């Protein structure tokens, strides 16, 4: 049967950026031609696979990451970006096999008094492993002395939020993403195309 | 003590070459969005560059491959190398502690910079 | 690209006055902005982050308002520590670097 790319691309609830959403794809077959002949994406950038020359090739699983962030931040979602999103909130591998697909979303993920639903990690020691999750709340030790759950100067809540109102240029406007990740393990292949 | 110290300033002939140093206490230098602002005399501040804490640096589009910003974790001290310096370069460099949507709320005082002939 | 407008250059201003200071984004940037007063021969001083949150140590005299274009800074009762120069400030812009407004001088009325 059908690969049910329509939960993932078309739902009403879009996850923040920090704990971003993973759709594990199997047992189906996936119509692309629904995805690439599409007018409504402002971004679709494939990486190792070509986007129409996809349905003739098998894999083991396709993963399908959604979330929301800015405009300006749309850039970072790719191989070897640095930033705040690609360093602290999601990385693709340099080695990456997939494709990433982008719109704006301004009339959907703003609200009038600004949607503070959306966050991002703004504060991390390091950055993460590709396609590492990272969904801790601890206050972030920004100085010398220790936080111990109390913020403070020099002790800051590791999330922030968007607020994205509907006024944002481009740049401060939300965009919803899907990543498509498209794996081949030494298992039996699930997903093919039409 | 949250302060931010400068240090490294000085006179220099163009192309020439000078490091800055930003010695950090109370804040801690590796944990932190640390940027390089400068004004020249007169005129307003101009961001130089930053390094994230996970180690990813940027830079202003007029110092690219010729500054490098840098840090000494052990010294928590940030540092700035400029080479190739020309007389624009002229400015008080400021260290700053960056924290995004809360402001620039760490300033050191200043050192000196002035390239000329 | 996002240009930050501000005015007046200069004001006059005496002890007890409430002045303000007005900043105009050429878009939308929600809340992200910020306010700084800087000395002659010294660093700039955080005043208000996000709009309209007061930095602490602060005096609460100093008040910040606005959202999306529109923003003012507000001294409600002008101290004699309060004459210096006052700016605004696009908090995390795109592409990198600080777009600051061009200042506002608040010198001695006379």
């Known amino acids: 049967n059908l690969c049910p790319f329509g939960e993932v691309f078309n739902a009403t609830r879009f996850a923040s950026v920090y704990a971003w959403n993973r759709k594990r794809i199997s047992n189906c077959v996936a119509d692309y031609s629904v995805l690439y002949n599409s007018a409504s994406f402002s971004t679709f950038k494939c990486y190792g696979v070509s986007p129409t020359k996809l349905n003739d090739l098998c894999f083991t699983n396709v993963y399908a990451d959604s979330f929301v962030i800015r405009g300006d931040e749309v850039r970072q979602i790719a191989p070897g970006q640095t930033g705040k999103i690609a360093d602290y909130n999601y990385k693709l591998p340099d080695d990456f096999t997939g494709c990433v697909i982008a719109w704006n979303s301004n009339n959907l993920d703003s609200k009038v008094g600004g949607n503070y639903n959306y966050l991002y990690r703004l504060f991390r020691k390091s950055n993460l492993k590709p396609f590492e999750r990272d969904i801790s709340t601890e206050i972030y030790q920004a100085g010398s002395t220790p936080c111990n759950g109390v913020e403070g100067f020099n002790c800051y809540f590791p999330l922030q939020s968007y607020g994205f109102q509907p006024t944002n240029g481009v740049g401060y406007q939300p965009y919803r993403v899907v990543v498509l990740s498209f794996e081949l393990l030494h298992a039996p292949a699930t997903v093919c195309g039409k | 003590q949250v302060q931010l110290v400068e240090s490294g300033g000085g006179l220099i002939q163009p192309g020439g070459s000078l490091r800055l140093s930003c010695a950090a206490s109370?804040?801690?230098?590796?944990?932190?969005?640390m940027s390089w602002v400068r004004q020249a005399p007169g005129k307003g501040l101009e961001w130089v560059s930053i390094?994230?804490?996970?180690?990813?640096?940027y830079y202003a589009d007029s110092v690219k491959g010729r500054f490098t910003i840098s840090r000494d974790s052990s010294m928590n001290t940030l540092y700035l190398q400029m080479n190739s310096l020309r007389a624009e370069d002229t400015a008080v460099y400021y260290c700053?502690?960056?924290?995004?949507?809360?402001?620039?709320?760490?300033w050191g005082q200043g050192t000196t910079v002035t390239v000329s002939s | 690209e996002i240009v930050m407008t501000q005015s007046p250059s200069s004001l006059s201003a005496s002890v007890g006055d409430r002045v303000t200071i007005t900043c105009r984004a050429s878009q939308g940037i929600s809340s992200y902005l910020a306010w700084y007063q800087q000395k002659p021969g010294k660093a700039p001083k955080l005043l208000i982050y996000?709009?309209?949150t007061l930095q602490s140590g602060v005096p609460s005299r100093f008040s910040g308002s606005g959202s999306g274009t529109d923003f003012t800074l507000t001294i409600s009762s002008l101290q004699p520590e309060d004459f210096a120069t006052y700016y605004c400030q696009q908090l995390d812009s795109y592409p990198p670097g600080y777009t600051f407004g061009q200042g506002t001088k608040v010198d001695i009325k006379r």
């Open positions: 996000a709009a309209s």
């Open positions: 390094i994230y804490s996970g180690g990813t640096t």
């Open positions: 700053a502690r960056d924290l995004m949507v809360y402001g620039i709320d760490v």
């Open positions: 109370g804040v801690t230098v590796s944990s932190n969005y």
